[PDB]
RNA sequence: GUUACGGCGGUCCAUAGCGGCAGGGAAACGCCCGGUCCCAUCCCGAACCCGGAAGCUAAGCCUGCCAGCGCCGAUGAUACUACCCAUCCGGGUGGAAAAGUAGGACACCGCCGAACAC
RNA sequence: UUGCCUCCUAAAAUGUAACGGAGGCGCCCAAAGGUUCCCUCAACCUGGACGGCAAUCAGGUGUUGAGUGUAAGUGCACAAGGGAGCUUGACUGCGAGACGGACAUGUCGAGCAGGGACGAAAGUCGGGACUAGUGAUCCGGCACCUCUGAGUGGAAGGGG
RNA sequence: UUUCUUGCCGGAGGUAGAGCUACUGGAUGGCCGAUGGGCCCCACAGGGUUACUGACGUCAGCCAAACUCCGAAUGCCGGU
């Protein structure tokens, strides 16, 4: 808790591509951030699961 | 009646690994250090943890620039 | 000079009580102000 | 007594009693002085005793300088305790004195009285010490 | 074309008067007033941060351009200050607007001051700049007295190319500043 | 080829800095005037742009001289020390430290552009 | 007290023990990460109603002081420090070469995909100023896969 | 002979030594001169008056293992 190990999954390939920490208190909403989906072969928006 | 001390981290085995004049390969670690006690000179890069490594093959040299010690690599003439 | 973040600044004319005119830019949008004493009539400047 | 207002480290290694003094080896303040001839941890109690002896011998006039300051803490563990379980608490305040170090200086009109007072101090001290003079 | 009253007076007469009084080896030494900085330090913003907005509005209406909000570079607990708390407002006036603000401040505001007996000419920087403080903020017609909120001791300062107190006072007297000669 | 004219670049980056005294504008480096023109102020044409020569070397720039502050700084000696000799002392061979005075120094070169006479 | 990090001890490479001397920890940061650009006061005076040991402030020098996510060596007005824009180097996914340190740990050049900044100008910059901020294997999950599928036309029942 | 010994050459150190106005913690003097208490002139303007608590600063002097403006000897890493 406090800084959970959130999992960033892509919007298109819908693959859980990354795992990173986030302070739930400072950023309570799902972390939407641009990342690289290897399945898609390009940068796609990823958001927290 | 006891001592509050007794802890200590592992020695990180820092310092110069290739001294002046040593012929090194590209990517060879030259100095393990905390911070830039030596700065990356010529053909020498600086690692994330301040590890100075050779960018090109050659002989290690230690110079001084703007009063800062630097580690350079001098190319070695082909035989 | 920035476009619109800067507040308006228009030239204005003022007349004092003793009857001295004055022209200068000021934030007042009306452009006509009535000053009472002014420095052309203030006792400190005039004398004493 | 002489005790430091504070010390950055209160449990220090014993001062190394080696070599002759490199500084403070001449009378720089008074006319006469007490020069050490052996290494010793001269404690603040010994300094107090020596200076009181000098002052009480010279009585009314005269000036006394104490060049050494006991700012080195020698620790002592509690009595009847075995080896280990940490380092003892600070017990004595000592000045690391080496041969050639001038410990006390005295200005007094009467040479005989000055020398007798310095002799008092030397007898209070734990080392061999001689009476040196500014006149070289 | 257009030229402020005080700016034209400076360009036409003041330079010659100052040259004659303090004869300089070169024309470039002629003191020339430089940016005028007007400030409102709240201080009580720690208790009522809302006062910053009023200070901003008042400074805008007085000067003619937005006041930059200055936070705190320090956090002293004695006055309940933390790093970043908006603690004042600052306006820097340069050029035509600077000269026009000086002209208005000398021709309108200071005469309107209540029981105005002038300020002693001792507040000069010692290097050529003059700082003082207005006791209120209603003297300016832009700050209508009928819709004021509170009193803000208004800091003002004029920066000059003068070298010291003497040249600074000569310049400001030439510009026509009131002075409580003493 | 030369100039107290310029920029660009120069060293185990102060022997170069700081400070004091004296000097220069043909062209450069500057100083400077108003916002029709890109651009910018957490506000401000102060920093960045436009048209410039009506005017100026005050400052920056650079030149010469001052060793006052800083900087460098020997030789010698000592401290220290590797090895060796030495019953407790101490000594030999080799290496060898800041301060100061003796002192050094108010820095040290190439590319190109301007005028000068050829 | 037990693991990790920092210092001293530690005897100028590295390493070095003690129930030796001191501390930290084991987090935190989606804007404290990336990039691009820019900066600039440590304290006396005059002062700046209130607002002195402090304001918003203005000048000079203090010549690199000063201070600066969390203790040593570093980083400065060549800024690792302080502000700003981008929109997400928040640079991620495939990573010869070398290496430093038994396993474990740690460093990066560089090549490719995709992007982020800066663009004119270059083509340049692989989490945090760096070292702690962690726990092997087993066993289990959970998503995806061009794997398997206990006769199979085939699927269900394990692996990567 | 890559090992080792010796000579020479290149190299990074922060120990021994010191040095500290070069930093972080100290030391007898007087000093333009901080609260200045204290006599007060009798200003609540403003000012000498400081016998004594003595600011910064300054003067030769001194220490440190967790100090370093410095800094060996050895040792170590390479080359010859």
PDB file of C-alpha atoms in Angstrom, chain C residues 9-15 21-35, chain E residues 5 61 100 103-104 108 141-142:
ATOM      1  CA  UNK C   9      -3.437  51.297 -20.246  1.00  0.00           C
ATOM      2  CA  UNK C  10      -4.976  54.410 -21.823  1.00  0.00           C
ATOM      3  CA  UNK C  11      -3.823  58.018 -21.942  1.00  0.00           C
ATOM      4  CA  UNK C  12      -5.760  60.365 -19.657  1.00  0.00           C
ATOM      5  CA  UNK C  13      -6.021  64.055 -18.831  1.00  0.00           C
ATOM      6  CA  UNK C  14      -6.416  65.503 -15.341  1.00  0.00           C
ATOM      7  CA  UNK C  15      -7.199  69.010 -14.100  1.00  0.00           C
ATOM      8  CA  UNK C  21      -3.737  70.542 -16.654  1.00  0.00           C
ATOM      9  CA  UNK C  22      -1.888  67.237 -16.834  1.00  0.00           C
ATOM     10  CA  UNK C  23      -1.560  64.540 -19.518  1.00  0.00           C
ATOM     11  CA  UNK C  24      -0.282  61.034 -18.796  1.00  0.00           C
ATOM     12  CA  UNK C  25      -1.227  57.383 -19.176  1.00  0.00           C
ATOM     13  CA  UNK C  26      -3.012  55.756 -16.251  1.00  0.00           C
ATOM     14  CA  UNK C  27      -5.154  52.694 -15.627  1.00  0.00           C
ATOM     15  CA  UNK C  28      -8.249  54.911 -15.445  1.00  0.00           C
ATOM     16  CA  UNK C  29     -10.336  54.084 -18.514  1.00  0.00           C
ATOM     17  CA  UNK C  30     -12.478  57.234 -18.322  1.00  0.00           C
ATOM     18  CA  UNK C  31      -9.541  59.416 -19.360  1.00  0.00           C
ATOM     19  CA  UNK C  32     -10.736  62.443 -17.357  1.00  0.00           C
ATOM     20  CA  UNK C  33      -9.873  62.672 -13.658  1.00  0.00           C
ATOM     21  CA  UNK C  34     -10.208  65.556 -11.207  1.00  0.00           C
ATOM     22  CA  UNK C  35      -7.308  65.920  -8.772  1.00  0.00           C
TER      23      UNK C  35
ATOM     24  CA  UNK E   5       6.515  64.755 -19.379  1.00  0.00           C
ATOM     25  CA  UNK E  61      -4.272  49.551 -11.199  1.00  0.00           C
ATOM     26  CA  UNK E 100       4.937  58.194 -16.841  1.00  0.00           C
ATOM     27  CA  UNK E 103       5.373  61.802 -13.521  1.00  0.00           C
ATOM     28  CA  UNK E 104       2.017  60.754 -12.060  1.00  0.00           C
ATOM     29  CA  UNK E 108      -0.855  63.526  -8.405  1.00  0.00           C
ATOM     30  CA  UNK E 141      -6.737  57.943  -8.619  1.00  0.00           C
ATOM     31  CA  UNK E 142      -6.575  54.413 -10.037  1.00  0.00           C
TER      32      UNK E 142
END
